[PDB]
């Protein structure tokens, strides 16, 4: 029936057909992880008397600690929690290598300037976000701690600047900017003024200038030995079974075995000629594992034609016979050939002429109650030319035989209108 559906017809002709692609399904899962238990001080950088000035933004590095971001989702009320390049829910699993927290304070209107490519005075010279940005942004109103009646003038910006700074650049120079024919010998007059002038910070200021604490969590992806691992388990290790794995950030399915090719002390994983992941190193107790893909192969169905009989056989392309866990309504008569694992065919020894080619010599057919048989194909008859010198053979009769030979000449002249 699968062959009938693949052919899109109720009639199947004699021959070999391809129906689907057998593939061994995974059985277990692997969550291999190293030993890290200490928690990162995210709440520390989120609970400070003052965060930073917009030009004195902090770049606190976080490393070698388990960091759970589920608390940062439900047990918090940030107004802006956009996550660029990563999924906030799919964020408690990836084990990033370096994560930098850029801490500072901004206004309510200027909270939108923290974007990969956004313009504006804050987003041009005070802070630059690169295009390729896998990190997120954290921002919420804080009109309870930084709020000073006299104004938190310690926070200042840098409008007075000529060229936009390169991404992730910390500018410290507070010298007077040059904006014209000013001599800039101290001066602070004419067209030159203090780049860091002020921050009108009266508490009664509207939501467009209310304090907003911005912590940008920029984290590199999993292209190095993972250090900031997400919370999870660390399941044990299994071998010689097609299972899916989560080695650090590596994800895939394989039958990983004991590796033979030794690794250098600094190398983690390996690749073959076509840069395919071949071997890995255990985040747990150090052991090299030889990851190879599990068995798979396109199934083929051998039918003598629905007109002749409804008996069919199945040949799995490359599996080594035993891997037939689940079609497969019947069984028995299992015969392993160099081209696969024939099922439902009787392996006879009497060589005949090929009817349904299979591969590597074997060739099935429907020979008599009739059953499906498989055999080594026979090249021809056993005519013997009795060579002998001083002796010749001469005919005495002809036959005048007429043979039919067919050759195609032309196809159907078809034209297709593009528009």
């Amino acid at each position: 029936s699968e062959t009938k559906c693949t052919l899109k017809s109720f009639t199947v002709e004699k021959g070999i057909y391809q129906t689907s692609n057998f593939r061994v399904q995974p059985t277990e899962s692997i969550v291999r992880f190293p030993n890290i238990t200490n928690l990162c001080p995210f709440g520390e950088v989120f609970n400070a008397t003052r965060f930073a000035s917009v030009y004195a933004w902090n770049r606190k590095r976080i490393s070698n600690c388990v960091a759970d971001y589920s608390v940062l989702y439900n047990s918090a009320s940030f107004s802006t929690f956009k996550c660029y390049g990563v999924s906030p829910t799919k964020l408690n699993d990836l084990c990033f290598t370096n994560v930098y927290a850029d801490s500072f304070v901004i206004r309510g209107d200027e909270v939108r300037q923290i974007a990969p490519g956004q313009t504006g005075k804050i987003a041009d010279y005070n802070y630059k976000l690169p295009d390729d940005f896998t990190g997120c942004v954290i921002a919420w109103n804080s009109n309870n701690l930084d709020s000073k009646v006299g104004g938190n003038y310690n926070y200042l910006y840098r409008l007075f600047r000529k060229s936009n700074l390169k991404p992730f650049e910390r500018d410290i120079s507070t010298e007077i900017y040059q904006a014209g024919s000013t001599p800039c010998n101290g001066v602070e007059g004419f067209n030159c003024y203090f780049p860091l002038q002020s921050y009108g910070f009266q508490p009664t200021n509207g939501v467009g200038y209310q304090p907003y604490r911005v912590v940008v969590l920029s984290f590199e992806l999993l292209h190095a030995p993972a250090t900031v691992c997400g919370p999870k388990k660390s399941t044990n290790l299994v071998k010689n079974k097609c299972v899916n794995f989560n080695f650090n950030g590596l994800t895939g399915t394989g039958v990983l075995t004991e590796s033979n090719k030794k690794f250098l002390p600094f190398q983690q994983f390996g690749r073959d000629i076509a840069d395919t992941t071949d071997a890995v190193r255990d985040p747990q107790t150090l052991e090299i594992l030889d990851i190879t893909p599990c068995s798979f192969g396109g199934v083929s169905v051998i039918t003598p034609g629905t007109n002749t009989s409804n008996q069919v056989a199945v040949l799995y392309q490359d599996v080594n016979c035993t891997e037939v866990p689940v079609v497969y309504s019947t069984g028995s008569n299992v015969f392993q050939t160099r081209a696969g694992c024939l099922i439902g065919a009787e392996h006879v020894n009497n060589s005949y002429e090929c009817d349904i080619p299979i591969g590597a010599g074997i060739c099935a057919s429907y020979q008599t109650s009739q059953s499906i048989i498989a055999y080594t194909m026979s090249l021809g008859a056993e005519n013997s030319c009795a060579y002998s010198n001083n002796s010749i053979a001469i005919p005495t009769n002809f036959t005048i035989s007429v043979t039919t030979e067919i050759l195609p000449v032309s196809m159907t002249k078809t034209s297709v209108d593009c528009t």
Partner: protein, 372 residues
């Protein structure tokens, strides 16, 4: 498997692109069937398996370097063994790149070639045009010499020399194949082209194609479905274009290989099973026979060619005006060493006295130009 490795979020998107994977699978299946038909057409021409004669005393000729030798575990002639252990060239497998095995194993190809060879030695060429007729090998050599113009007496009177030359050439061809580095260039080039195509196809997997990452698992694990769908779409488009390019290149290369295989089958049928009078199509010089030899993914003929040698030039006249009548040669040229005249064959110097047996008269000698 290639476009979307065991990912539902990618297969359910590939389902939108219509019946493309079916088209590519059909094309590759057709290519494989064509390869099988190519091998069958080239080698399975005569369907009677002739046993290899035990003896090797073929009147002087030595068929030891082309005939199969049973001492080795593999029933291959020394030249076939050299051809096998000169083309050396890995197994991709992995991500949905399977290689099907050929229908006719190398042992079956060797047996077919041995059957053709034993038919050539025993029956000459009648085994390819009916029932095999045994005939002594010197007689078959004479009847192949008669095809190119020279008479039988050239071979029999020089049987030892001809056998020595044949053995020397057969011995030299093995050394020529082994010493020369290029040698088997076509088969190695075919293998190299296929390997490069497959390697490039695998290499196309590790390319972002305008997405955020080159791995579908990473993309579908780091992003929510509504925004990961675009990246998966970009990757699917890139991989589909790569697969289409590979399939088209394979189709064109398979068409070229089919043309070459048709040419090889024509050569096998028109040279081994007979003797061709087409000039410089079946060797350099006049053709006598050929000996097929199996090679990995191809065939290697050993054409045997009669080629003239050291020549002596005489003076010639179109006809002879004897009694007013202009005798013309029957099957020869009129030559002379300066004093006496002779009539001899066109491709060998075998002078004969000009008798009425070797000439025919066609009227008076006042019309021909240059008659002597």
């Amino acid at each position: 498997m290639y476009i979307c490795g065991d990912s539902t979020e990618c297969s359910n998107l590939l389902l939108q692109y219509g019946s493309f994977c079916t088209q590519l699978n059909r094309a590759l299946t057709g290519i494989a069937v064509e390869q099988d038909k190519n091998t069958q057409e080239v080698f399975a021409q005569v369907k009677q398996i002739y046993k290899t004669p035990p003896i090797k005393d073929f009147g002087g000729f030595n068929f030891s370097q082309i005939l199969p030798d049973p001492s080795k575990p593999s029933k291959r002639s020394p030249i076939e063994d050299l051809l096998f252990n000169k083309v050396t060239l890995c197994a991709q497998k992995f991500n949905g790149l399977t290689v099907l095995p050929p229908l006719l194993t190398d042992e079956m190809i060797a047996q077919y070639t041995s059957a053709l060879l034993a038919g050539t030695i025993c029956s000459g060429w009648t085994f390819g045009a009916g029932p095999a007729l045994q005939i002594p090998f010197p007689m078959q050599m004479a009847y192949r010499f008669n095809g190119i113009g020279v008479t039988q007496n050239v071979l029999y009177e020089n049987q030892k020399l001809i056998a020595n030359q044949f053995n020397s050439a057969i011995g030299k061809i093995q050394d020529s194949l082994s010493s020369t580095p290029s040698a088997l260039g076509k088969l190695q080039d075919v293998v190299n082209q296929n390997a490069q195509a497959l390697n490039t196809l695998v290499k196309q997997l590790s390319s972002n194609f305008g997405a955020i990452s080159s791995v579908l698992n990473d993309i579908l694990s780091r992003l929510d479905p509504p925004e990961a769908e675009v990246q998966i779409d970009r990757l699917i488009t890139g991989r589909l274009q790569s697969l289409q390019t590979y399939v088209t290149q394979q189709l064109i290369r398979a068409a070229e290989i089919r043309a070459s295989a048709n040419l090889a089958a024509t050569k096998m049928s028109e040279c081994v099973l007979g003797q061709s009078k087409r000039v410089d199509f079946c060797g350099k010089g006049y053709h006598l026979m050929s000996f097929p030899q199996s090679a990995p993914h191809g065939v290697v003929f050993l054409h045997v060619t009669y080629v003239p040698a050291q020549e002596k030039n005489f003076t010639t006249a179109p006809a002879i005006c004897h009694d007013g009548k202009a005798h013309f040669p029957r099957e020869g040229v009129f030559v002379s060493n300066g004093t006496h005249w002779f009539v001899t064959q066109r491709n060998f110097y075998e002078p004969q006295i000009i008798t009425t047996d070797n000439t025919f008269v066609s009227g008076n000698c006042d019309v021909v130009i240059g008659i002597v």
